[PDB]
Design a protein around this ligand. Structure first.
Ligand SMILES: N[C@@H](CCC(=O)O)C(=O)O
Lengths: 258, 258
């Protein structure tokens, strides 16, 4: 009756502890989602096993094979009982798995190298010297592609045809590109990651402007799983009790290096 | 098979149109939730009738009789098919009705008459000169009643017993009390409402400090209703289409006076 939890190595959600090689089982891991898993399991009265998603992906459907990858695939295909991770609640995912109400909110945001003369999306859109882009797939890119807002439409037209490519293959790549580009690249990404990186050495990036959209991370379970009802109530309780806000502070701010 | 929508008069979510006595049915109303209802109906392929909740309340469960009032009551007891309203998703409500993923975020916040020497809940809690209260039969009051967070527990202990009563029957009543009390009343209400009022004449109130919590409004249906899955998908679709932010921007900000 041990619950198999799928999650992903993404800081500060799930990280290998300092001495992890000398440790076993759930004790190898630390982070926001590790803490959150422990609290959900306590509330629902279950034992569980943390497992890192085999392919290191969140969950997208291949247009050709129709196969779901990532944590969503592990749920869809019966390999895990619950995903506890920074997994964005999207329409296509909601169609195939069940989600709790969100445990954390986020929106698209702008990361700059400190000293970059940019304070908003409008600022980016009106100029050319400072390049800017998104992950080469997912929620952030799709936001721009689809936007009917003039500023964002202008930004998309620019990003889609910019040379060399302004797209990056991973979050770490986007962050590195801001850091290496001497103020000549701004990266559009989730607020949560932006805010986390801002609190980390070498303390050379900053989040600017308001968020461009709004979405949430949810706990996911296989469609119709009986675990879903209980974990959803657990999320609502933990939020109301102030525990979710505490955990955010714990992992983003309390020991911020900046 | 007309779907009966319960809702509530609350600006800018649902408002009486100017010539409403000369108007019929759904055409009597305007606002964010009126627009949202139309969009959800369109996505979901139903006809509907907007109805204003009979008792003018959001919804709470009486501790003695255990009966639910407000919009929640109308869903619980079978008097409406769906609520499309600024209806906060809470644990106690989630137990008795179904909710979509949130279509708007909010937190409890403090409204003051401008120059009132209060910057935080802590400030309110440490003094008695400036009275403070909340809306009856809503999630803000239920939050304080249930809170084990020390500062909020202290504020509830005060509010529950304050004379004369610090509680109001409608959001508009709390706002008027703030405006008429020469800085000696502060009103605890949701950030969304606070920010709307802050940008309306006579421009004499302000939101102070950070939000006290973080939560969201959901579209609600009776537990197990078939409309639920569909309406939830609609909310996700509308968010991904930019329509929720469009409506927010339309009814807030665009309508600012101050
Ligand atoms: N949105 C709240 C009402 C407003 C309040 O309680 O401040 C509810 O659903 O009860």
């Amino acid at each position: 009756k041990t619950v198999v939890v799928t999650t992903i190595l993404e800081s500060p959600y799930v990280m290998m502890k300092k001495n992890h090689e000398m440790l076993e089982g759930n004790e190898r891991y630390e982070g926001y989602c590790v803490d959150l898993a422990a609290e959900i399991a306590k509330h629902c009265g279950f034992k569980y096993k943390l497992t890192i998603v085999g392919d290191g992906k969140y969950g997208a459907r291949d247009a050709d094979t129709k196969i779901w990858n990532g944590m969503v695939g592990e749920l869809v295909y019966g390999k895990a009982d619950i995903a506890i991770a920074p997994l964005t609640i999207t329409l296509v995912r909601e169609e195939v798995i069940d989600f709790s109400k969100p445990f954390m909110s986020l929106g698209i945001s702008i990361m700059i190298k400190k000293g970059t003369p940019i304070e908003s999306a409008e600022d980016l859109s009106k100029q050319t010297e400072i390049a800017y882009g998104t992950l080469d797939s997912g929620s952030t890119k799709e936001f721009f592609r689809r936007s009917k807002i003039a500023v964002f439409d202008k930004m998309w037209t620019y990003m889609r045809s910019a040379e060399p490519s302004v797209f990056v293959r991973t979050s770490a790549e986007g962050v590195a590109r801001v850091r290496k580009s001497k103020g000549k690249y701004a990266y559009l990404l989730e607020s949560t990651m932006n805010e986390y990186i801002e609190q980390r050495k070498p303390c050379d990036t900053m989040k600017v402007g308001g968020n461009l959209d709004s979405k949430g991370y949810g706990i996911a379970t296989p469609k119709g799983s009986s675990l879903g009802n209980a974990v959803n109530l657990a999320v609502l309780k933990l939020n109301e009790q102030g525990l979710l806000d505490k955990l955010k502070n714990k992992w983003w701010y309390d020991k911020g290096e900046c």
